[PDB]
Amino acid sequence: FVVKELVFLVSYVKNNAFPQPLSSSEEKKYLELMAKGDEHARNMLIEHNLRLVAHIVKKFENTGEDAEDLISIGTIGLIKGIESYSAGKGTKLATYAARCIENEILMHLRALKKTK
Amino acid sequence: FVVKELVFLVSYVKNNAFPQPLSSSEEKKYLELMAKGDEHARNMLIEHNLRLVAHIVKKFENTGEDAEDLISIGTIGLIKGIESYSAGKGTKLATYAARCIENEILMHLRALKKTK
Amino acid sequence: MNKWLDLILKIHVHPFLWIIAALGLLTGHMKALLCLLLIVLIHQLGHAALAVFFSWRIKRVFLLPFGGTVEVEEHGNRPLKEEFAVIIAGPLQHIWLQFAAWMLAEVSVIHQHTFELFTFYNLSILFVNLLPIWPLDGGKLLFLLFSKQLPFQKAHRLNLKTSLCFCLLLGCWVLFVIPLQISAWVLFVFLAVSLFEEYRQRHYIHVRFLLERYYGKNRELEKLLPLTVKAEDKVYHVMAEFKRGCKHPIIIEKSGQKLSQLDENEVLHAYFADKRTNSSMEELLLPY
Amino acid sequence: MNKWLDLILKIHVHPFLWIIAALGLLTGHMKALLCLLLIVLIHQLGHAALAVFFSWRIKRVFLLPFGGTVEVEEHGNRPLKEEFAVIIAGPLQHIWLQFAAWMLAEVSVIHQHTFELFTFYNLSILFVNLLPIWPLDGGKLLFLLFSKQLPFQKAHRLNLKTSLCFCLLLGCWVLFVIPLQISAWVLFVFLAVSLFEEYRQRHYIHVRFLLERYYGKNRELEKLLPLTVKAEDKVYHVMAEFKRGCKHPIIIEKSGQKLSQLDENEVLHAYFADKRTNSSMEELLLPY
Numbered sequence: 099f100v101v102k103e104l105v106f107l108v109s110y111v112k113n114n115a116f117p118q119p120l121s122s123s124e125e126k127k128y129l130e131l132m133a134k135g136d137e138h139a140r141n142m143l144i145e146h147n148l149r150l151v152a153h154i155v156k157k158f159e160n161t162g163e164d165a166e167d168l169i170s171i172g173t174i175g176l177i178k179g180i181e182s183y184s185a186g187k188g189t190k191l192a193t194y195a196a197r198c199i200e201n202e203i204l205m206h207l208r209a210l211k212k213t214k
Numbered sequence: 215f216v217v218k219e220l221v222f223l224v225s226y227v228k229n230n231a232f233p234q235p236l237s238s239s240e241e242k243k244y245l246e247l248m249a250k251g252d253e254h255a256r257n258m259l260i261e262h263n264l265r266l267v268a269h270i271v272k273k274f275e276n277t278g279e280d281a282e283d284l285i286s287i288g289t290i291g292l293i294k295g296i297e298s299y300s301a302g303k304g305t306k307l308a309t310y311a312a313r314c315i316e317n318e319i320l321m322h323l324r325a326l327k328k329t330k
Numbered sequence: 331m332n333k334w335l336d337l338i339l340k341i342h343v344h345p346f347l348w349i350i351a352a353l354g355l356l357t358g359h360m361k362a363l364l365c366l367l368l369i370v371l372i373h374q375l376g377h378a379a380l381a382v383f384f385s386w387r388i389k390r391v392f393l394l395p396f397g398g399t400v401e402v403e404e405h406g407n408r409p410l411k412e413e414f415a416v417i418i419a420g421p422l423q424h425i426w427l428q429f430a431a432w433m434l435a436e437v438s439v440i441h442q443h444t445f446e447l448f449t450f451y452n453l454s455i456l457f458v459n460l461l462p463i464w465p466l467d468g469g470k471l472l473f474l475l476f477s478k479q480l481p482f483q484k485a486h487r488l489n490l491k492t493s494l495c496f497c498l499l500l501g502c503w504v505l506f507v508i509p510l511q512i513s514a515w516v517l518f519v520f521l522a523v524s525l526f527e528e529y530r531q532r533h534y535i536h537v538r539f540l541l542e543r544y545y546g547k548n549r550e551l552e553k554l555l556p557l558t559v560k561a562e563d564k565v566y567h568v569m570a571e572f573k574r575g576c577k578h579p580i581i582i583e584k585s586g587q588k589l590s591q592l593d594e595n596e597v598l599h600a601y602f603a604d605k606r607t608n609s610s611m612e613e614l615l616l617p618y
Numbered sequence: 619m620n621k622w623l624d625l626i627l628k629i630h631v632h633p634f635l636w637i638i639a640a641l642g643l644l645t646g647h648m649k650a651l652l653c654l655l656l657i658v659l660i661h662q663l664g665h666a667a668l669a670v671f672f673s674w675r676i677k678r679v680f681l682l683p684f685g686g687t688v689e690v691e692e693h694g695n696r697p698l699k700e701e702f703a704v705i706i707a708g709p710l711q712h713i714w715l716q717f718a719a720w721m722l723a724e725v726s727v728i729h730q731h732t733f734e735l736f737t738f739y740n741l742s743i744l745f746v747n748l749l750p751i752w753p754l755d756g757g758k759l760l761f762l763l764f765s766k767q768l769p770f771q772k773a774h775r776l777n778l779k780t781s782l783c784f785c786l787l788l789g790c791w792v793l794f795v796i797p798l799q800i801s802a803w804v805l806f807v808f809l810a811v812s813l814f815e816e817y818r819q820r821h822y823i824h825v826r827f828l829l830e831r832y833y834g835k836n837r838e839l840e841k842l843l844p845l846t847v848k849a850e851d852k853v854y855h856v857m858a859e860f861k862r863g864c865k866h867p868i869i870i871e872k873s874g875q876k877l878s879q880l881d882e883n884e885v886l887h888a889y890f891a892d893k894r895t896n897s898s899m900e901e902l903l904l905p906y
């Protein structure tokens with residue numbers, strides 16, 4: 099019938115899982131509100147800065163463990179890093195967060211080695 | 215019979231209103247020519263830098279002021295600044311012209327406010 | 331809403347679309363291209379306009395070669411009401427386009443061929459962007475219906491399974507009937523690739539949902555639904571069965587007998603803040 | 619011998635034109651692309667030859683997908699003759715092109731249908747390049763005709779209004795009567811965009827005109843035109859009536875009484891150098 103002469107088109111909303119990194123101004127105001135005190139700022143910052151967990155887990159393969167536990171350790175270490183962040187150390191926030199995530203993964207690996 | 219076979223196309227001249235910025239080498243020659251005594255050099259120097267008038271006047275808009283007076287004072291300020299510019303100090307002419315026109319428009323606005 | 335104007339002036343276009351337009355301009359297919367572009371642009375603009383109303387983090391509206399795409403940023407961290415409202419922004423939009431086409435045909439601005447062509451293309455795109463697939467609005471309605479009486483993780487698992495089954499059915503139908511019409515093949519490839527992507531991103535989606543739940547702000551507090559669980563599993567296995575937009579008073583069963591009632595706040599805070607992510611749930615009765 | 623070298627090595631082409639040309643070469647349309655390219659190039663060089671002869675300041679000879687442009691930096695900068703000798707040189711190369719064609723094809727060098735197509739496209743371009751719409755070519759001739767008997771502001775307003783009304787007529791004819799004809803829609807869009815851009819800068823042209831008027835030193839003095847105004851008129855209003863290429867002595871009228879004639883250069887110098895503006899003729903009559 100009409101199947102011979104047809105065109106198929108797509109119009110959908112694509113939901114990203116990892117938001118793009120945020121520039122200095124908005125993260126500066128988010129940290130200012132952090133100093134004022136607000137949990138929504140924490141939620142927004144951790145949401146926008148979740149890509150580092152993905153990078154660390156991707157480069158930390160060949161270990162033989164699961165994925166859910168690694169992601170949970172990554173995100174809890176990220177939370178620990180953000181709540182302990184200080185602007186006087188003299189280094190980028192991303193590098194400090196990556197160091198914290200690596201430290202937490204190493205702690206988990208040492209704990210697993212001790213248990214095993 | 216004839217329509218649906220015409221290729222309209224255009225061929226015009228596109229008379230612009232904003233000349234290109236002058237180079238970094240012809241400026242010294244133009245300044246020397248003006249120093250020895252010339253007027254076409256002054257015309258070319260005050261016509262090449264007309265976009266600054268637009269740049270500052272656009273910032274001062276939405277203040278209940280007509281464009282005629284704003285542009286008139288802007289051009290007057292630019293001609294006053296170029297008329298009394300000294301190259302001994304050493305600074306890009308754009309910043310000097312911008313400061314001159316901004317000061318002139320601020321003075322005119324203050325005078326108008328004092329009149330009211 | 332000047333963000334509407336910002337988005338409409340921030341509409342990207344894929345480079346292959348220019349080549350398609352060039353091929354369609356020297357051959358004589360401008361009417362079909364204009365109709366399809368108009369329909370897709372109206373769909374995308376309606377979606378973006380209704381999404382801006384709820385103040386989401388819209389990135390950009392761009393036209394890839396074989397359709398359109400709105401880059402919504404928030405995935406699985408909102409009450410289902412606005413999600414269900416925004417998804418229906420396009421299936422409830424072709425109606426007024428059809429009405430306008432009818433009026434223009436009646437006033438005789440357009441003759442009696444372009445009207446049929448436009449109606450055919452409109453009622454084809456409406457029925458194509460409704461199939462029970464993920465993506466396409468069919469999935470973003472069936473999955474929302476699923477997430478009303480089922481846990482989020484189970485709902486997502488069953489949604490992706492059904493999407494895979496229906497995609498395989500469509501692929502088999504296309505291979506059996508039409509061995510041509512490249513549009514079907516490119517649609518199938520797109521469906522497979524996107525299904526793989528949202529199969530791979532499930533862990534991060536779930537973690538995002540859980541973290542958003544923990545940092546809640548009492549978003550339209552709905553009725554409380556209990557949760558009876560034995561005290562012999564892992565805490566990550568008891569937090570999994572969380573419904574959408576509901577606060578759960580956790581009831582624990584010690585050897586088949588009720589022991590204590592705990593709110594989600596204390597257990598989830600002990601899981602995240604107190605770093606007891608891999609110990610147990612039983613010792614959370616007496617943390618100190 | 620050296621001036622035209624940069625004009626030769628300053629040709630810029632839009633990438634979309636490259637894509638269109640490549641696809642037209644691919645899909646049969648080879649006999650048509652060369653004709654249009656040759657006509658457009660000849661017309662553009664005809665425009666540029668007179669401009670470079672008058673020692674103007676050109677920028678770039680572009681090639682849009684729908685035509686060609688030769689951007690110059692002289693608006694209100696040169697007298698009527700200088701602009702006319704360049705504008706008329708556009709619709710004056712098609713004559714010698716037709717003279718060459720009617721002798722080359724008649725001696726039977728190539729074929730008949732090629733000559734027929736060439737003549738069709740050439741005449742179509744020639745009669746499209748003379749619609750009284752800004753900018754095109756006929757519109758600028760109409761603007762020149764107005765400017766010679768009207769004040770500059772009056773000419774620049776009446777020309778704008780006439781171009782606007784003709785643009786609306788063309789848009790109505792294209793949208794409501796003629797079939798699709800994408801080459802007409804693109805023409806209408808380009809005309810509307812250019813007209814709006816010209817309207818948005820209806821103010822800097824006047825100040826450029828006055829500024830150029832300030833620094834004319836014995837610029838081939840011409841007809842002296844008495845001008846008379848009242849005494850309470852503002853300085854800007856009396857300066858608004860300055861037609862191109864005319865020196866205007868000013869006669870002030872103090873409600874039936876005239877004090878003394880004032881030179882135009884005196885008033886203009888009072889405007890710019892002495893900054894004695896925002897006042898009436900009484901202030902300029904009695905200085906510091």
Ligand SMILES: CCCCCCCCCCC(CCCCCCCCCC)(CO[C@H]1O[C@@H](CO)[C@H](O[C@@H]2O[C@@H](CO)[C@H](O)[C@@H](O)[C@@H]2O)[C@@H](O)[C@@H]1O)CO[C@H]1O[C@@H](CO)[C@H](O[C@@H]2O[C@@H](CO)[C@H](O)[C@@H](O)[C@@H]2O)[C@@H](O)[C@H]1O
Pocket residue numbers: 218219221355356357358359638642647649650651654655658682683684685731732734735800801804
């Ligand atoms: C700066 C340089 C730019 C150069 C651009 C490309 C240059 C090539 C121009 C391409 C173009 C005009 C398009 C111009 C749009 C561009 C506007 C830009 C706007 C940018 C946004 C000129 O193409 C002409 O080339 C001539 C050479 O052969 C031919 O006419 C000569 O005439 C004889 C004498 O009378 C001679 O004796 C003889 O030799 C030739 O027959 C024809 O091919 C044609 O007239 C092709 O137009 C197209 O129109 C449409 C419907 O009209 C046609 O579609 C289909 O036609 C039927 C057949 O499929 C289908 O059944 C139908 O379904 C469909 O309708 C196309 O087919 C094509 O015709």
Ligand SMILES: CCCCCCCCCCC(CCCCCCCCCC)(CO[C@H]1O[C@@H](CO)[C@H](O[C@@H]2O[C@@H](CO)[C@H](O)[C@@H](O)[C@@H]2O)[C@@H](O)[C@@H]1O)CO[C@H]1O[C@@H](CO)[C@H](O[C@@H]2O[C@@H](CO)[C@H](O)[C@@H](O)[C@@H]2O)[C@@H](O)[C@H]1O
Pocket residue numbers: 103104105347350359361362363366367370395396397443444447512513516
């Ligand atoms: C951002 C939007 C992007 C949209 C893209 C372009 C959208 C434009 C659609 C383009 C397209 C559909 C193909 C879609 C595939 C694209 C998939 C995209 C994947 C990207 C990777 C038009 O399809 C429709 O266009 C309509 C235009 O009028 C016409 O319908 C009519 O309209 C009114 C007039 O009568 C009436 O009222 C109405 O009753 C009619 O029905 C018909 O042409 C047709 O119905 C292509 O046409 C296709 O069909 C035929 C030609 O006929 C071609 O067959 C060829 O024939 C020989 C001659 O070469 C070849 O020798 C042969 O080999 C080959 O078999 C196909 O090959 C293909 O050309």
Ligand SMILES: CCCCCCCCCCCCCCCC(=O)OC[C@H](COP(=O)(O)OCCN)OC(=O)CCCCCCCCCCCCCCC
Pocket residue numbers: 361364365368427430431434439440441444448793794795796797798
């Ligand atoms: C933003 C767009 C407007 C809202 C969308 C509503 C949907 C429009 C439905 C009309 C039929 C489908 C049209 C698809 C193209 C087509 O196929 O046009 C084909 C017809 C050809 O007419 P004919 O050859 O049959 O005439 C036969 C003569 N004997 O040209 C049209 O009629 C175009 C006129 C209607 C288009 C809307 C005009 C809007 C005016 C204001 C502009 C605002 C921005 C517009 C941006 C383009």
